[PDB]
């Protein structure tokens, strides 16, 4: 009956906790006691990009570290050249409410999604000067939150119906569906080699998957409320998360438990964006405070602040060469720091 | 500057020239959100208002005195609404329709109203409140099968306010019942506010035609308030 199954589940959880206690012989803050602090980090704007009429809700870089893409809630998708502050493309959408965007590593396509439960794909290299829609992907049952390209023919999506999907573009149908969450899913991050990826939910849970087989492998807990952002450490052996309880944490995929927690006593608001740097010695985080904070990752102290936004910060990004940082916010502006 | 840079600047100017036309059309339209429950008559007012003219969201366009109004109704979603409600923090108003002929569900509606009133990102958004289905209430009160004081004890100690205007010529029991629930809503409205948003109650039925003019007249009042507060006069 259900009683025996629940008792077995409780025993399994107890065994898991017992096996997780005896794997922790040291604390990171003790091994990292002799590390030199990085100093004080001061940054200042170099470009301010204007042109949007409403909130800016997502952004993404390109493999060439010169081009950008930005998405707003008035129905616009803009492609920027950040060196000279030009405008290369402005694409209108069909639904105003958009929540994600992305380049493909080949510099040929973009994609977006939102409240209407569709993912739209746009071609950039037509013979004429006009950009048109190449494909529309339908079949979710809840608002999409994030999407990331793999090749020019494979995409991965996350929705508010508690499921993740893998899509083949030319055919136009799913090849694998990932089920297992209890709440909504909020953020994703693909691996450097593109063989596994991580997802966090509106529960205090996160998971790791396998794109080929199509199954869950490890589950991590520890937070107290919803999980808002997630990303990968450069080597693919860690990931850092932030939650709507004024706390960030760091997780590993072999010890299967926490290693650091970033928080304070004057911080009583949540986290919206999380982004690493090229070496792993900086962790940048966004708040509705309305600031951005720069955390040393190996000692859990603040080493810098970034101010200048009049409203909530929603997005954040770094480049593939390490030269700039781009920040957007609900006040309709993007700012570049170096 | 070589030829490539010239061409780049020409294209950028040609793009700004179109964004300047997009600004006006974006700014000349107003956005509204529509909320209710499964037994509220939400779609009937939409059908009536369309005379003035799978999927995760719908849209309806109507026009009053050469002013263009957009209305949005949500669909194909789950029952948890604490992540996609953050998208509607720049609308002119929120419309809230409530069924006032089923005594077994009004407590749920009150609890749904409080969470909207006291949310963080919706503290500058006003509400237009429709108390639907006043025809059914008349017969349910006159007939005498159900007792209103069995779901709410305080009704045993209530007197009609002297500012009430029972124009139609009805049985006073109907007026007591009508105004009790509006007082129940306006208590929550008045208690925790801070002078930054308001509430507007109305009595509707399934055969009214005047539901566009009221939204028009209330949106004027909202905008006038915003303009006066931006000068530090209110």
């Amino acid at each position, epitope marked *: 009956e259900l009683d025996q199954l629940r008792q077995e589940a409780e025993q399994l959880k107890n065994q898991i906790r017992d096996a997780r206690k005896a794997c922790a012989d040291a604390t990171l803050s003790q091994i990292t006691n002799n590390i030199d602090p990085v100093g004080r980090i001061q940054m200042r704007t170099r470009r301010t990009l204007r042109g949007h009429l409403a909130k800016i809700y997502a952004m993404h870089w390109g493999t060439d570290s010169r081009l950008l893409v930005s998405a707003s809630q008035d129905g616009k998708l803009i492609i920027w050249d950040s060196y000279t502050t030009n405008k290369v493309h402005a694409i209108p959408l069909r639904s105003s409410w958009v929540m994600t965007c992305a380049y493909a590593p080949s510099g040929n396509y973009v994609a977006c999604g939102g409240l209407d439960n569709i993912c739209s794909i746009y071609n950039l290299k037509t013979r004429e000067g006009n950009v048109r829609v190449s494909r529309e992907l339908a079949g979710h049952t809840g608002y999409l939150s994030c999407c990331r390209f793999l090749d020019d023919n494979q995409i991965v999506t996350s929705s508010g119906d508690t499921t993740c999907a893998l899509w083949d573009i030319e055919t136009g149908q799913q090849t694998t569906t990932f089920t297992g969450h209890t709440g909504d899913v909020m953020s994703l991050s693909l691996a450097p080699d593109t063989r596994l990826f991580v997802s966090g939910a509106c*529960d*205090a849970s996160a998971k790791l998957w396998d794109v080929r087989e199509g199954m869950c492998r490890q589950t991590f807990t520890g937070h107290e409320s919803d999980i808002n952002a997630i990303c990968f450490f450069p080597n693919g052996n860690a990931f850092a998360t932030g939650s*709507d*309880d004024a706390t960030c944490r760091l997780f590993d995929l072999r010890a299967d438990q926490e290693l650091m927690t970033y928080s304070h006593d004057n911080i*009583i608001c949540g986290i919206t964006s999380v982004s690493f740097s090229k070496s792993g010695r900086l962790l940048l985080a966004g708040y509705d405070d309305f600031n951005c904070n720069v955390w040393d990752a190996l000692k859990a102290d603040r080493a810098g602040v970034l101010a200048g936004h009049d409203n909530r910060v929603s997005c954040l990004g770094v480049t593939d060469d390490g030269m700039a940082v781009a920040t957007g916010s609900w006040d309709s502006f993007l700012k570049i720091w170096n | 500057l070589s030829a490539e840079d010239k061409a780049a600047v020409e294209r950028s100017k040609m793009i700004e020239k179109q964004l300047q036309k997009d600004k006006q059309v974006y700014r000349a339209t107003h956005r509204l959100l529509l909320l209710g429950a499964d037994n509220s008559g939400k779609s009937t007012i939409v059908k009536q208002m369309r005379i003035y003219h799978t999927s995760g969201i719908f849209e309806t366009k109507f026009q009053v005195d050469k002013v263009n109004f957009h209305m949005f109704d949500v669909g194909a979603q789950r*029952d948890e*609404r*604490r992540k996609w409600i953050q998208c509607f923090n720049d609308v002119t108003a929120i419309i809230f329709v409530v069924d006032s002929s089923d005594y077994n569900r009004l*407590q749920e509606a009150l*609890n749904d109203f409080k969470s909207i009133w006291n949310n963080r990102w919706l503290r500058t958004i006003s509400v237009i409140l429709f108390l639907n289905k006043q025809d059914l209430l008349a017969e349910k009160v006159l007939a005498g099968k159900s007792k209103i004081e069995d779901y709410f004890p305080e009704f045993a100690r209530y007197t009609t306010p002297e500012d009430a205007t029972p124009e139609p010529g009805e049985d006073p029991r109907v007026t007591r019942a009508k105004y009790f629930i509006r007082d129940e809503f306006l208590r929550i409205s008045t208690a925790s506010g801070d002078g930054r948003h308001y509430c507007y109650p109305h009595f509707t039925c399934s055969v009214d035609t005047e539901n566009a003019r009221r939204i028009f007249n209330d949106c004027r009042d909202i905008i006038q308030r915003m303009h006066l507060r931006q000068y530090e006069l209110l």
Partner: nanobody
Amino acid sequence: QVQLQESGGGLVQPGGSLRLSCAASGFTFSNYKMNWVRQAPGKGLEWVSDISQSGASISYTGSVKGRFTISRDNAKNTLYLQMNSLKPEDTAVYYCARCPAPFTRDCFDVTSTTYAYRGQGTQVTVS
């Protein structure tokens, strides 16, 4: 890992009394608002009683306003409910409920079909 475990059910004559106790584990207990919910045999999820972060705001549904009493104890991490003169229409299954966020007054998604911060429940029968 949020845990909320209930205790104190049973069978009682009409007019009797009993005490419900919820124990919590896995969060700072004093930052969060708390609630009570019940599921009557044949209906949806209802709402009964409320309490605030400190212990100085209290609120009830209409029909339990003379009989049931709510309290919390931040030191022992426990939420309480006492009932005095029971009627047969109180037979149900009883859950405690948290709020999604800390330091707030709005209470979203407590009565939904699926929701992550909500105990398993306890059965109360009156006859």
